[PDB]
Design a protein around this nucleic acid. Structure first.
Lengths: 56, 59, 180, 29, 141
RNA sequence: ACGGGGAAUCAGGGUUCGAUUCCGGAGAGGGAGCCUGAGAAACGGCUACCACAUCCAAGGAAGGCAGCAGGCGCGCAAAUUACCCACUCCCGACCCGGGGAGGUAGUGACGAAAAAUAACAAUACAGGACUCUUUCGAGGCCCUGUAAUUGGAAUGAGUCCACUUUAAAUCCUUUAACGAGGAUCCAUUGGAGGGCAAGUCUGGUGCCAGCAGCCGCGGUAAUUCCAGCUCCAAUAGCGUAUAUUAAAGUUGCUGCAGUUAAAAAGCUCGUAGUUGGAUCU
C-alpha cells in the first residue's frame, strides 16, 4: 500500500549511548569464573530459585 | 641439541670432484654465473629465428 | 601431482543435542576440575575413549582364542597400562569398558605438574607449562595436553633455563634490579 | 508464587514461561 | 503381504524403484521439472537488477506491509520478488541496483507470513545489508 | 554420466557423492585426411573445409593456452605475467646440457592439528562452609568475589643483532637487547516465550515499524519489535543460503501400511515369474 513509513521505529527510538564497562575475560579464566559461580561457593539459598538473570 | 650431517674427504681435489656445487660455493671454491633464467630462455628463443653464424650475434 | 599428503583427521565430535542441561553441567565440572580452555578440549578426550571402547567392543565379539583378539587385544591393553590409565593387575579386555574420562584427564601433564607439587593450582600449572618452565627428562614441553607415561612421570622438573630451576632471573626481576 | 502463576496463566500468552518456572520450582536446580 | 522368496530380487527392487516416485522428495529432486522452474537454477544465491520497490501485504491473522523488491535476475532474465529483512533497509536500496539474493529458508516455499516470497536480499551494491544496518559500512556514492 | 581405487553419513541394513594429484579412457575450436617414425590418424607436425581471428604497401603471409603465468568474458563461485633445476625423476651423442614435469616462495578463515588473551600472594568482606561458644562472637582452617584494593614475580605477541635453514632466501626452531596493569597488548558471533541453555528488568513503539525456520509476538502494562543493562551457548571463530546424509519403521530386505485415517482389482479362467507335501544310512 505505502512504502512511506519504513525505518520508523528505529529512527524514532531515543538513541541511548552504550555505557562503558570493563573488559570481560576470555578462555580458560572465563570458564574458571563461571565454574566458580555455579559449583563452588554457590550460595546455599532459596530452594529451586536458581534461575540466574532472575529479575525479581 | 643440534643435529646435522658432515662429510670428511680424503683430499681437497676429491672434495672438488665429488661435491654439490652449492656446498663448494659456501666455502668460496666455486662461483656460479650470475645470469638469470628468464634471460637464458629468451636468448635461446631469439636465436632459433636465425641460421648459422648469426646465432652468435644475437643480443 | 604434488609430493604432499592430504591425510588429516578430526579429534573431536560435537554432541547431537546442543543445549541439554545435565550435559553442560557435567562438562563444566570436568573443565573446572582440570582447567581446560573450552568444551572442545573435553570432547577431544570423549573421542579417544569412544574409539578405544569401540576397538574393545569388537574384540570382545571374536572367539576368545582368535589371533586378532589375542594380538590387538594385547596391544590395546599395553598402551593403557603404559600411559597409566589401566592398572597392571587389570589386564583383561573387559576392564576397558570400565574406563572413564577422568582417568585420561588425570594423565595430562598439567594435572601432573599440579599434583607433583610444582604448581599450586590447576591454573598455575597450565600457565607454567605454556611459558616453558616444565621439562620431561631433558625436553621442555609446551603442551598442556601431554599424556604422561608411567615411566616418564618421575622425570618432571623445572627446565634448567628457567628462573624457577637453574635460574637466570626473569625480565621483570632484572629490570627491578636495574631500577634500584 | 509459581503454583498460583501457573494456575492463573496456563491458558494465556505467558503459559510456557509459567510452565518453565513451575518445573524449575518442582525439579530442584 | 510381500513376496519373500530367495529368487525375488527383481520383483523387490523394481517395485521399490517404482514406488519411490510416489514420494514428494524423490519426485522433486529426480524429475527435472522442479529444477527448470527454480529461477536460481539450483544455485544457492543469485544476482539481479532491482526493478522496483514493492509493498506486499501480510496474510490474514496478522497485519503489516512487508517491504519487498521486484528484481530481474542477471543470468536468465527471470523476475523475482525478494524480501528486504530489517527495518529501514528498504531505505538503503535504490533502483537499478546490483543486488545479491538468497533463498529464504524453506527451500522454495514461502516463509510464514509473507505470501509467495521465496527469496531475500543479502547484498546491495556489493555491500552487505548487515554492514549497512549495524553501521559498519556506507553505500558508495 | 568419463569408469574404477575411493568419499561423506551410518546400531545393523542402507542412502548420496567421486570434474579433482593413483590406474584406465578420451580430446586438443568443429569435422576430415595424412607425412615421418619402433610407436601418432600426433595438433607447442602438416593439408583442406566450417566457424572465428592477425599482419598487409591489397600482391600476399601467418594461427590454435581443455601446458605455466596472465587477461577478457561468464557467473554465487576459484591464487603470482615470481625464483630454481639444489631435491624427485625424465630425455639426449651425455658424470658436464635441458626440463612452467617437478621443487621453492607469494596470495590462501576450503579444510585439518596444536594453542595465548593472564597467574600468584597479602589485605578487606555486616562473604560462605568448617572447630568452640546455648547464641553473640572467637580462628593463619578451607574456598569465593562485580574490591579501576595493594604487591612485585612469570611470560609471550611484537621490535629486532647474530646463527641455523636454503640453490639463494623466507618461515619455524636457537639465542642477544628491548617489550605488560584498565597488563586500552580491549574477542567475537548469535540469542534470552516454547521447541532450546539463558530476564512477564527498564525506556521507545502502538496490528504501525518490524520479529518470527514452526507455533506465534505486536491493536497504550510487548517475557517475542527497537535500544540500555544483565544473563546464556560455542569460542578465533560464529551466523545465513543451497546440495546431501542421519533423524525417516515418512520407501520399510532387515522393517511400514490398505474396515472407518491415503489405500483390495466386478467376477472367474489363465502364460511367464515367484513358491511348492512325506520318503532312500
Amino acid at each position: 500500500g505505502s512504502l512511506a513509513r519504513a525505518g520508523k521505529v528505529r529512527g524514532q527510538t531515543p538513541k541511548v549511548a552504550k555505557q562503558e564497562k570493563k573488559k570481560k575475560k576470555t578462555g580458560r579464566a572465563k570458564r574458571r569464573m563461571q565454574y566458580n559461580r555455579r559449583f563452588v561457593n554457590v550460595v546455599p539459598t532459596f530452594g529451586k530459585k536458581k534461575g540466574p538473570n532472575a529479575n525479581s | 641439541k643440534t643435529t646435522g650431517f658432515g662429510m670428511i674427504y680424503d683430499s681437497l681435489d676429491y672434495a672438488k670432484k665429488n661435491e654439490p656445487k652449492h656446498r663448494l660455493a659456501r666455502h668460496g671454491l666455486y662461483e656460479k654465473k650470475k645470469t638469470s633464467r628468464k634471460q637464458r630462455k629468451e636468448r635461446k628463443n631469439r636465436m632459433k629465428k636465425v641460421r648459422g653464424t648469426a646465432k652468435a650475434n644475437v643480443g | 601431482p604434488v609430493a604432499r599428503s592430504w591425510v588429516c583427521r578430526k579429534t573431536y565430535v560435537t554432541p547431537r543435542r546442543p543445549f541439554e542441561k545435565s550435559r553442560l553441567d557435567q562438562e563444566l565440572k570436568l573443565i573446572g576440575e582440570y582447567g581446560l580452555r573450552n568444551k572442545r578440549e573435553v570432547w577431544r578426550v570423549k573421542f579417544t575413549l569412544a574409539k578405544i571402547r569401540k576397538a574393545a567392543r569388537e574384540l570382545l565379539t571374536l572367539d576368545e582364542k582368535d589371533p586378532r583378539r589375542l594380538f590387538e587385544g594385547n596391544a590395546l591393553l599395553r598402551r593403557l597400562v603404559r600411559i597409566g590409565v589401566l592398572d597392571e593387575g587389570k589386564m583383561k579386555l573387559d576392564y576397558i569398558l570400565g574406563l572413564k574420562i577422568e582417568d585420561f584427564l588425570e594423565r595430562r601433564l598439567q594435572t601432573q605438574v599440579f599434583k607433583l607439587g610444582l604448581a599450586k593450582s590447576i591454573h598455575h600449572a597450565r600457565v607454567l607449562i605454556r611459558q616453558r618452565h616444565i621439562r620431561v627428562r631433558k625436553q621442555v614441553v609446551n603442551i598442556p595436553s601431554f599424556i604422561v607415561r608411567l615411566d616418564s612421570q618421575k622425570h618432571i622438573d623445572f627446565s634448567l633455563r628457567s628462573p624457577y630451576g637453574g635460574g637466570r632471573p626473569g625480565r621483570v626481576k632484572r629490570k627491578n634490579a636495574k631500577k634500584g | 508464587d509459581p503454583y498460583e502463576d501457573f494456575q492463573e496463566n496456563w491458558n494465556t500468552k505467558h503459559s510456557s514461561g509459567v510452565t518453565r518456572e513451575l518445573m524449575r520450582e518442582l525439579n530442584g536446580g | 503381504g510381500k513376496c519373500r522368496g530367495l529368487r525375488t530380487a527383481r520383483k523387490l527392487r523394481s517395485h521399490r524403484r517404482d514406488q519411490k516416485w510416489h514420494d514428494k522428495q524423490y519426485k522433486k529432486a529426480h524429475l527435472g521439472t522442479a529444477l527448470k522452474a527454480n529461477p536460481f537454477g539450483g544455485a544457492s544465491h543469485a544476482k539481479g537488477i532491482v526493478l522496483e520497490k514493492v509493498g506486499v501485504e501480510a496474510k490474514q491473522p496478522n497485519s503489516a506491509i512487508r517491504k519487498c523488491v521486484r528484481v530481474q535476475l542477471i543470468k536468465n532474465g527471470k523476475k523475482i520478488t525478494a524480501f528486504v529483512p530489517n527495518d529501514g533497509c528498504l531505505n538503503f536500496i535504490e533502483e537499478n541496483d546490483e543486488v545479491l539474493v538468497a533463498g529464504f529458508g524453506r527451500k522454495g516455499h514461502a516463509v510464514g507470513d509473507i505470501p509467495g516470497v521465496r527469496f531475500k536480499v543479502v547484498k546491495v551494491a556489493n555491500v552487505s545489508l548487515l554492514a549497512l544496518y549495524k553501521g559498519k559500512k556506507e553505500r558508495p556514492r
